């Protein structure tokens, strides 16, 4: 909580529906029923669910804490089957959500325990890999369509070497780390640019221009966090012209990573933007080269494409 988790989920549902033309599915697996009530009405506020007319983009499938292990174990399958329809029949690019995936692993362990089986390491089921494998491999790209799943992970005891997350980690193609420290700086969405990674980040897959521009932003942000430690202990005098130039550019970069959403139009002002892939690469590439050094930091904060950052700077200049 406290990172815009549900706001990110609703936006991904909205954007995939708007751009790719595919519906979404949310599977409430073993979490709080209160949280279901919170999400249900938030989706009506944003408009991804619509009661008045058949224009809804989400199909909800809930089986929470209050229901027994057998129920909680196979909720993910119930939600998956709804997502499988839109892939197999209507040929859509489907967007599944499983919150939380640890509860699938827990409920699987609880059912395996009650059935009377000699448990594996750390009290988990003998059929840990197979239960995960039979579920995850259904979530794939077929020739008919695809199902892109966004699975929330609770790592028990902050231990990545624990069987529950480790077995899950084999199937993951990416991550999206939402930090509270980033959210406190005012940068929404609160995605950590450093800690968030993907398997497809490779020059062969995404392309030559994508990888280099992406690694360029990852370099300057790592250099920013390094040089910021020197500012705290020693001072601003220590940083040279080479150092102080990269710090000013990095602050513009991390502000350009922020974006106003269509979901948060009823929450607050600012019209929601959908930024294309080519517009994103073109935007960040020009900052690293150093084209928009003359423009201030405030213009990059909360905009769609790079064009709006130029337009906002002139509009903000009229004030003072």
């Amino acid at each position: 909580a406290g990172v815009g988790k549900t706001v990110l989920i609703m936006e991904l549902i909205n954007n995939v529906a708007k751009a790719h033309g595919g519906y979404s599915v949310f599977a409430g697996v073993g979490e709080r029923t209160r949280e279901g009530n919170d999400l249900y009405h938030e989706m009506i506020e944003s408009g991804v669910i619509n009661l008045k007319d058949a224009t809804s983009k989400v199909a909800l499938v809930y089986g929470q804490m209050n229901e027994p292990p057998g129920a909680r174990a196979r909720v993910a399958l119930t939600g998956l089957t709804v997502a499988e329809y839109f892939r197999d029949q209507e040929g859509q690019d489907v967007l599944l959500f499983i919150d939380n995936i640890f509860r699938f692993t827990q409920a699987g362990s609880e059912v395996s325990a009650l059935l009377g089986r000699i448990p594996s390491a750390v009290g988990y089921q003998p059929t840990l890999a197979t239960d995960m494998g039979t579920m995850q491999e259904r979530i794939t790209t077929t020739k008919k369509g695809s199902i892109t799943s966004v699975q929330a992970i609770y790592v028990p005891a902050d231990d990545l070497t624990d069987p529950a997350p480790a077995t899950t980690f084999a199937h993951l193609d990416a991550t999206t780390v939402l930090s509270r420290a980033i959210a406190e700086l005012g940068i929404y969405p609160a995605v950590d640019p450093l800690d968030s990674t993907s398997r497809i980040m490779d020059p062969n897959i995404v392309g030559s221009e994508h990888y280099d521009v992406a690694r360029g932003v990852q370099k300057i942000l790592q250099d920013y966090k390094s040089l910021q430690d020197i500012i705290a202990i020693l001072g601003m005098d220590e940083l040279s012209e080479e150092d102080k130039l990269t710090v000013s550019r990095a602050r513009k970069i991390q502000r350009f990573l922020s974006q106003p959403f269509q979901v948060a139009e009823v929450f607050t002002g600012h019209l929601g933007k959908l930024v294309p892939l080519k517009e994103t690469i073109k935007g960040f590439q020009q900052i690293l080269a150093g084209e928009y050094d003359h423009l201030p930091e405030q213009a990059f904060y909360m905009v769609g494409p790079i064009e709006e950052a130029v337009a906002k700077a002139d509009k903000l200049a009229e004030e003072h």
Binding site: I231, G235, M236, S248, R251, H294, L295, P296, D314, A317
Partner: peptide, 22 residues
């Protein structure tokens, strides 16, 4: 200091654009 330096730098760049569009 941290942000005091670049907050001051950001204010100067606003004044540059204000003078430029005149």
């Amino acid at each position: 200091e941290e942000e005091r330096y670049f907050r001051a730098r950001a204010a100067e760049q606003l004044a540059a654009l204000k003078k430029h569009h005149e």
